[PDB]
């Protein structure tokens, strides 16, 4: 029952953008004519006649489904299968059940798209703000009702005499290939529309000497790769000479066949649509690139190596790029599961927003058990360095160093206190994670799906049971390709090789995900790490990142660095650093559908892997977790939709200015691809100094690395550490190892910790409403200058999520930057200094300042007028981990100067993920706040959308720019008292000794502080006279 659909697989190898050319037309079919095929529910069918562009007398018939997916959010969907019947996926971002839920709801509200065919056979329908006509050859024209402006239309190619063929729908003749494609008109060079293409996940793009946000005029591919430094040599163009730089035509770790189009930007007629081709074979997005004749300036396309063809167009409910992102998250939502909290993504435990240090190259938990080796370091020493210098420090990412000789799910004796492996909870022999708990830390460990196979007698229960229950990927293929064999076997198993450099390597077996039982089995292994204290998950080598291998060499032998190349191609022998593309893996896209060669679904392996860890690991064994029941996953690769499993770090970056640039750009682009909780390794993972690899990050690059990343969602300093036993990496990178910059380093980490609720609320808003935490400058509407500023300017936070403006310095040894403040609003310079001094005057939005001064101790960060920001301090004044905070450590609602005599605020509150009752039982609180001025009276109002988590400690209002009132009155459900001046005269005295109902005139920071009881938080009217 392998290969149910009778497909002949024509390509297995990596076909770069340079070899993908649907606009060529040769051997390609495109829609030439149709007749109507009925409408059931909201899915129309058109019976489309496809014609070979370069000889239209050759024609085939395939039905194409046209389904409206949301009336209120203006999204519909084209879908056909060139190779067989149209099939609903059973795994992926877009599920039928969620589409059904959305439709059923909008139908109950009497939404009517009025899908109809005309006399002529043209399908017409309408969404809320748009109307669509699709002609005979499937020519498509999408119009916005309010101004009658055509916002999107697909491409038509002419023939000699056979009429116009719609490249809106294309597939390669199956006598010659398997590729699909879809082409639109591209208005990038229109004088008025100036169309720009955004999104596309982790892709990097250089312009002159700089890494930029926009993705216009370039040819990209998704092909999840083990792409160290984002510029792997085998990923080079044909006949490329000299250094390969990271750039647009190089795949990354995450697969985002997703672009958001933006035209007429910063004007009253702005339009925005998202474009999603839902395919997990190698996929392409060309946004008007003439290089290698892969595209044409005036066309834009998407395509893939394999079928099926299934594509979403998503315009959003209303104005602006951001609205495209939230509508997209809804098609991917879990509303049909009745998720009270996790609608658009899964909420992490709060601790995920803390500062982590990871290291590849620790050799024990405690010093007393650290083996001798040049530059060896213990987990304990890192903890000390951070803790003793009073860093706000959350915990560790313990690498494969911890494992027993690379046996995933195991530990070795050195990573325990008593130097032997225990089964857990013995107060006389604590695991790394347990010991880490007592320091008030939480931990991830590295988990790959590489199940070591060369075991030299030594028993490994995980690889063993996989063999026994036949849950491994078999060594079958439709080509008779010999994947290699060892003396360990099994005979019919795919045996890959894991290689970490410097002779640290092993043979592996892998989970055949598509099988029943594999996910359950996978997930039940995590029991072995949860019961010894493991907090969350660091998913890695996800492709799987297998050692480069050429068919016909021993499993442990990799090819010459230079192979394959254009003169000496792969010709079906290279494994492109994962499974050899021909291996028959059990279908991951369609359950109980059979086996298919991996080439078909490369870009879904990591998704599935994350999926299984989240549902069979983290959720099913939630009981085996120790200190915190909720958990998370930081994954290296995945697909669109991966946000219901957890977040991402952007694999192996390096330690240069360019990589700071890229980090910010990846973060912005990843967010808008519906993956909010993402970030890059702070300081850069790999070595950078070509004369000596062990040279650590400089202090000025680390400062700027820290400052750019300090408000991004995932904040982990991680690096490859040179040790004697693994001789690649840098000497160190930990923040405390930078004595000259230590004070700045630490204060920017404090600053983040004070604004932990700003992060957390932003994440709630993402889980409930799909808003991206990080906003591109171009998401700010009615500004025609944010576009030029979009490489390094980004926003977040507050009630709307556009209250904080960041513009980090992105070059080393630099103390100026060109600053642009978004127009029609005011900004206030802020940062780690400003907690303890008054604000400077207001800065006028719409300002361009060249050479804006940014000394090293500073980053550019502004809080908008009308912002009220939930802010947290420690009661005792010392820096501690977020995960050891209680409600007694103050909440403070910082009221910034009023905008239009108004300010606004939002705080999500829950236990932090100690339990799972916020996402399971709706046990959480949303507090909102407002401030208004009206002559001599200011009114501060607390309301709740719901109050199901009880904030057990006193909270504060910090009014900036106010001093001594004549009276403050508080009104509340069970309270109505006038406030009295506190006999405390310092913030520290107010926190610890101040009375519920005290106020304090802070002259030092020009703020008035109200201390209020915990029970007035869900509802209050505070009036300042």
Ligand X SMILES: OC[C@H]1NC[C@H](O)[C@@H](O)[C@@H]1O
Residues forming contacts to ligand X in the complex (CB under 6 A) are 360, 399-400, 446, 500, 540-541, 636, 651-652, 685, 718
Taking the least distance from each CB to ligand X, the nearer of 139 and 718 is 718
Name the residue with tokens 């927003």.
353
Residues 6+ apart with CB under 8 A from 21: 292, 293, 294
State the binding partner of 18 from Cl ion, ligand X, none, CB within 5 to 8 A by kind.
Answer: none
Distance between CA atoms of residues 791 and 926, nearest Å: 33
Compute the residue count for the chain.
Answer: 1025
Residue 584: CB minimum distance to ligand X, A: 27
Taking the least distance from each CB to ligand X, the nearer of 616 and 652 is 652
Residue 736: CB minimum distance to ligand X, A: 20
Among 165, 407, 636, 803, binds Cl ion (CB under 5 A): 636
State the binding partner of 637 from ligand X, Cl ion, none, CB within 5 to 8 A by kind.
Answer: Cl ion
Taking the least distance from each CB to ligand X, the nearer of 362 and 916 is 362
Taking the least distance from each CB to ligand X, the nearer of 45 and 463 is 463
Segment interacting with Cl ion (CB under 5 A) among 250-258, 386-394, 557-565, 844-852: 250-258
Residue 500: CB minimum distance to ligand X, A: 6
Residue 224: CB minimum distance to Cl ion, A: 6
Taking the least distance from each CB to ligand X, the nearer of 289 and 399 is 399
Distance between CA atoms of residues 573 and 427, nearest Å: 53
Question: Strand 536-539 relative to strand 633-635: parallel, antiparallel, unpaired?
Answer: parallel
State the binding partner of 249 from Cl ion, ligand X, none, CB within 5 to 8 A by kind.
Answer: none
Which tokens is 958 given?
Answer: 């910090």
Rg (alpha carbons) of the chain, rounded to whole number? 29
Taking the least distance from each CB to ligand X, the nearer of 265 and 400 is 400
Distance between CA atoms of residues 731 and 722, nearest Å: 6
Taking the least distance from each CB to ligand X, the nearer of 734 and 910 is 734
- Residue 214, phi then psi, degrees to nearest 5: -60, 155
Taking the least distance from each CB to ligand X, the nearer of 186 and 613 is 613
State the binding partner of 542 from ligand X, Cl ion, none, CB within 5 to 8 A by kind.
Answer: Cl ion
Question: Strand 536-539 relative to strand 496-499: parallel, antiparallel, unpaired?
Answer: unpaired
State the binding partner of 360 from Cl ion, ligand X, none, CB within 5 to 8 A by kind.
Answer: ligand X
Name the residue with tokens 């401030």.
931
Footprint of Cl ion on 350-409 (CB under 5 A):
none
Site string for Cl ion, 251-290 (x = CB under 5 A): --x-------------------------------------
With CA atoms as reference, report the closest residue to 502 among 407, 655, 653, 373: 373
Residue 253: CB minimum distance to Cl ion, A: 5
Residue 402: CB minimum distance to ligand X, A: 10
3-state secondary structure 558-616: CCCCCCCCCCCCCCCCECCCCCCCCCEEECCCCCCCCEEEHHHCHHHHHHHHHHHHHHH
Taking the least distance from each CB to Cl ion, the nearer of 716 and 754 is 716
- Residue 975, phi then psi, degrees to nearest 5: 175, 140
Q: Which residue's C-beta sits nearest to ligand X?
A: 360
Taking the least distance from each CB to Cl ion, the nearer of 234 and 750 is 234
State the binding partner of 336 from Cl ion, ligand X, none, CB within 5 to 8 A by kind.
Answer: none
Longest dimension (CA), the chain: 92
Distance between CA atoms of residues 680 and 666, nearest Å: 8
State the binding partner of 273 from ligand X, Cl ion, none, CB within 5 to 8 A by kind.
Answer: none
**Is 1014 strand, coil or helix?**
helix
Distance between CA atoms of residues 954 and 889, nearest Å: 9
Footprint of Cl ion on 972-1001 (CB under 5 A):
none
The runs of H, that is alpha helices, within 652-755 are: 657-671, 699-709, 742-754
Distance between CA atoms of residues 8 and 3, nearest Å: 9
Taking the least distance from each CB to ligand X, the nearer of 580 and 716 is 716
Bridge partners, 853 (sequence order): 816
Distance between CA atoms of residues 687 and 223, nearest Å: 25
Segment interacting with Cl ion (CB under 5 A) among 69-77, 357-365, 471-479, 637-645: 637-645
Residue 253: CB minimum distance to ligand X, A: 9
Segment interacting with Cl ion (CB under 5 A) among 47-55, 76-84, 200-208, 249-257: 249-257
Taking the least distance from each CB to Cl ion, the nearer of 450 and 1009 is 450
Residue 935: CB minimum distance to ligand X, A: 58
State the binding partner of 399 from ligand X, Cl ion, none, CB within 5 to 8 A by kind.
Answer: ligand X
Taking the least distance from each CB to Cl ion, the nearer of 56 and 251 is 251
Taking the least distance from each CB to Cl ion, the nearer of 29 and 576 is 576
Segment interacting with Cl ion (CB under 5 A) among 275-283, 552-560, 628-636, 772-780: 628-636
By CB under 5 A, tell whether 696 contacts Cl ion. no
Residue 73: CB minimum distance to ligand X, A: 36
By CB under 5 A, tell whether 637 contacts Cl ion. yes
Residue 557: CB minimum distance to ligand X, A: 21
Is the Cβ–Cβ distance between 417 and 365 less than 8 Å?
A: yes
State the binding partner of 563 from Cl ion, ligand X, none, CB within 5 to 8 A by kind.
Answer: none
State the binding partner of 472 from ligand X, Cl ion, none, CB within 5 to 8 A by kind.
Answer: none
Residue 752: CB minimum distance to ligand X, A: 21
Residue 230: CB minimum distance to ligand X, A: 12
- Residue 63, phi then psi, degrees to nearest 5: -85, 140
Is the Cβ–Cβ distance between 42 and 115 less than 8 Å?
A: yes
Which tokens is 105 given?
Answer: 């709801």
Distance between CA atoms of residues 464 and 470, nearest Å: 10
Residue 812: CB minimum distance to ligand X, A: 23
Instruction: Give first-to-last CA distance, the chain, whole Å.
Output: 79
Taking the least distance from each CB to Cl ion, the nearer of 177 and 637 is 637
Which tokens is 639 given?
Answer: 């697909």
10 Å Cβ neighbour count for 278? 24
With CA atoms as reference, report the closest residue to 582 among 536, 534, 549, 616: 549
Is the Cβ–Cβ distance between 710 and 348 less than 8 Å?
A: no
Distance between CA atoms of residues 619 and 813, nearest Å: 47
By CB under 5 A, tell whether 605 contacts Cl ion. no
Which tokens is 747 given?
Answer: 């204060």
- By 3-state DSSP, what share of the chain in percent is helix, strand and coil, each rounded to 5? 20, 30, 50
State the binding partner of 652 from ligand X, Cl ion, none, CB within 5 to 8 A by kind.
Answer: ligand X
With CA atoms as reference, report the closest residue to 366 among 351, 349, 381: 381
Residue 636: CB minimum distance to Cl ion, A: 4
Taking the least distance from each CB to ligand X, the nearer of 232 and 281 is 232
Name the residue with tokens 């021993």.
554
Total residues binding Cl ion (CB under 5 A) = 5
Phi-psi region of 480 (alpha: psi -120 to 50; beta: other; left: phi over 0): left
Residue 720: CB minimum distance to ligand X, A: 7
- Residue 130, phi then psi, degrees to nearest 5: -135, 155
Name the residue with tokens 């808008």.
672
Residue 501: CB minimum distance to Cl ion, A: 16
Footprint of Cl ion on 494-553 (CB under 5 A):
542-543
- Residue 665, phi then psi, degrees to nearest 5: -75, -45
Taking the least distance from each CB to ligand X, the nearer of 117 and 360 is 360
With CA atoms as reference, report the closest residue to 1024 among 963, 954, 952, 942: 963
Give the footprint of Cl ion on this chain (CB under 5 A). Answer: 253, 542-543, 636-637
């Amino acid at each position: 029952t392998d290969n149910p659909d009778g497909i002949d697989y024509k390509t297995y190898d990596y076909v770069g953008v340079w070899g993908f050319s649907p606009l060529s037309n040769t051997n390609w079919f495109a829609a030439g004519s149709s007749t109507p095929g009925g409408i059931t529910d909201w899915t129309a069918t058109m019976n489309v006649n496809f014609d070979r562009i370069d000889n239209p007398s050759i024609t085939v018939q395939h039905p194409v489904q046209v389904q409206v997916t949301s009336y209120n959010n203006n999204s519909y969907r084209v879908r056909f299968n060139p190779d067989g019947p149209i099939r609903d996926v059973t795994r992926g971002p877009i599920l039928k059940q969620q589409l059904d839920w959305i439709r059923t709801q909008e139908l109950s509200e009497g939404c009517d798209p009025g899908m109809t065919f005309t006399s002529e056979g043209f399908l017409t329908f309408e969404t809320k703000d748009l109307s669509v006509i699709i002609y005979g050859n499937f020519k498509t024209r999408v119009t916005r009702k309010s101004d009658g402006k055509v916002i999107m239309e697909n491409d038509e190619v002419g023939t000699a005499s056979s009429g116009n063929k719609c490249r809106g729908l294309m597939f390669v003749d199956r006598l010659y290939g398997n590729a699909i494609a879809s082409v639109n008109k591209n208005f990038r060079n229109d004088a008025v529309k100036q169309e720009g293409f955004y999104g596309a996940g982790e892709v990097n793009c250089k312009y002159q000497d700089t890494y930029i946000l926009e993705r216009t005029g370039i040819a990209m591919t998704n092909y999840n790769y083990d792409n160290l430094n984002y510029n792997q040599w085998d990923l080079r163009p044909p006949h490329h000479d000299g250094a390969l730089n990271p750039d647009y035509y190089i795949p990354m770790y995450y697969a985002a066949p997703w672009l958001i189009v933006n035209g007429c930007a910063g004007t009253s007629e702005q339009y925005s649509y998202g474009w999603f081709m839902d395919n997990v074979s190698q996929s392409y997005m060309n946004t008007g690139d003439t290089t290698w004749n892969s595209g044409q300036e005036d066309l834009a396309y998407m395509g893939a190596q394999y079928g099926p063809f299934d594509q979403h167009f998503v315009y959003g409910a209303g104005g602006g790029m951001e609205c495209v992102v939230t509508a997209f998250s809804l098609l991917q939502g879990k509303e049909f599961e009745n998720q009270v909290l996790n609608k658009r993504s899964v909420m992490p435990p709060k601790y995920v927003f803390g500062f982590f240090q990871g290291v590849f190259g620790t050799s024990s938990l405690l010093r007393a058990h650290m083996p001798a080796g040049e530059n060896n370091i213990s987990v304990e020493e890192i903890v000390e360095g951070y803790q003793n210098n009073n860093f706000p420090f959350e915990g560790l990412a313990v690498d494969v160093d911890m494992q027993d000789n690379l046996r995933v799910f195991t530990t070795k004796g050195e990573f325990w206190t008593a130097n032997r492996v225990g089964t857990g909870g013995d107060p006389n022999n604590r695991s790394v994670f347990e010991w880490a708990h007592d320091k008030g830390l939480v931990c991830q460990t590295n988990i790959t799906c590489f199940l070591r196979n060369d075991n030299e007698g030594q028993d490994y229960e995980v690889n063993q049971t996989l063999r026994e229950r036949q849950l491994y990927t078999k060594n079958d293929s439709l080509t008779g390709t010999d994947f290699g064999m060892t003396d360990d076997g099994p005979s019919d198993a795919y045996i890959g090789h894991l290689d970490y450099g410097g002779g640290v390597e092993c043979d592996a077996l892998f989970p055949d995900w598509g099988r029943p039982d594999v996910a359950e089995w996978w997930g039940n292994n995590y029991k072995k790490l949860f019961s010894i204290g493991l907090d969350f998950v660091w998913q890695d080598m996800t492709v799987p990142a297998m050692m480069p291998h050429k068919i016909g060499d021993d499993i442990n032998v990799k090819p010459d660095g230079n192979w394959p190349n254009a003169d000496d191609p792969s010709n079906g022998q290279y494994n492109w650093k994962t499974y050899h593309p021909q291996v028959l893996v059990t279908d991951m896209r369609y359950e109980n559908h059979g086996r298919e060669p991996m080439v078909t679904q490369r870009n879904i392996h990591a998704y599935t892997l994350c999926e299984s860890t989240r549902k069979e690991g983290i959720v099913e064994n939630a009981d085996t977790l120790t200190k915190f029941r909720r958990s998370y996953i930081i994954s290296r690769g995945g697909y669109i939709g991966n946000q219901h499993f957890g977040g991402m770090w952007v694999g192996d970056n390096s330690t240069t200015s360019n990589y700071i640039q890229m980090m910010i750009a990846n973060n912005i682009n990843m967010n808008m691809s519906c993956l909010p909780l993402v970030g890059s390794d702070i300081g850069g993972f790999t070595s950078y100094d070509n004369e000596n690899q062990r040279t650590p990050c400089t202090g000025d690059l680390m400062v700027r690395y820290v400052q750019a990343g300090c408000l991004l969602p995932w904040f982990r300093n991680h690096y490859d550490r040179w040790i004697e036993s693994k001789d690649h990496g840098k000497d160190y990178q930990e923040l405390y190892m930078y004595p000259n910059e230590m004070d700045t380093l630490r204060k920017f980490v404090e600053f983040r910790y004070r604004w932990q609720e700003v992060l957390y609320t932003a994440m709630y808003q993402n889980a409930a409403f799909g808003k991206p935490i990080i906003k591109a400058a171009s998401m700010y509407n009615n500004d025609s200058n944010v576009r030029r500023a979009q490489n390094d300017h980004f926003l977040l936070g507050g009630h709307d999520g556009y209250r904080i403006l960041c513009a980090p310095v992105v070059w080393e040894n630099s103390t100026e930057r060109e600053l642009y403040l978004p127009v029609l609003t005011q900004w206030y310079k802020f940062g780690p200094d400003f907690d303890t001094k008054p604000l400077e005057g207001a800065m006028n939005g719409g300002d361009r300042i060249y050479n804006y001064p940014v000394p090293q101790s500073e980053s550019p960060i502004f809080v908008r007028e009308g912002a009220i920001l939930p802010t947290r301090y420690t009661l005792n004044g010392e820096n501690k981990s977020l995960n050891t905070y209680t409600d007694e450590d103050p909440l403070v609602f910082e009221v910034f100067p009023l905008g239009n005599n108004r300010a606004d605020g939002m705080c999500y509150l829950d236990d932090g993920g100690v339990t799972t009752n916020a996402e399971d039982n709706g046990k959480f609180s949303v507090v909102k706040v407002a401030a208004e001025q009206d002559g001599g009276t200011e009114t501060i109002t607390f309301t709740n959308d719901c109050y199901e988590y009880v904030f057990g400690g006193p909270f504060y209002v910090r009014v900036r720019g106010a001093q001594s009132p004549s009276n403050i009155h508080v009104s509340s459900g069970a309270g109505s008292q006038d406030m009295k001046v506190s006999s405390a005269t310092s913030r520290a005295a107010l926190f610890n000794d101040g009375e519920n109902g005290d106020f304090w005139v802070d002259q030092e920071t020009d703020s008035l502080w109200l201390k209020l009881p915990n029970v007035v938080l869900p509802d209050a009217v505070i009036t300042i006279t």
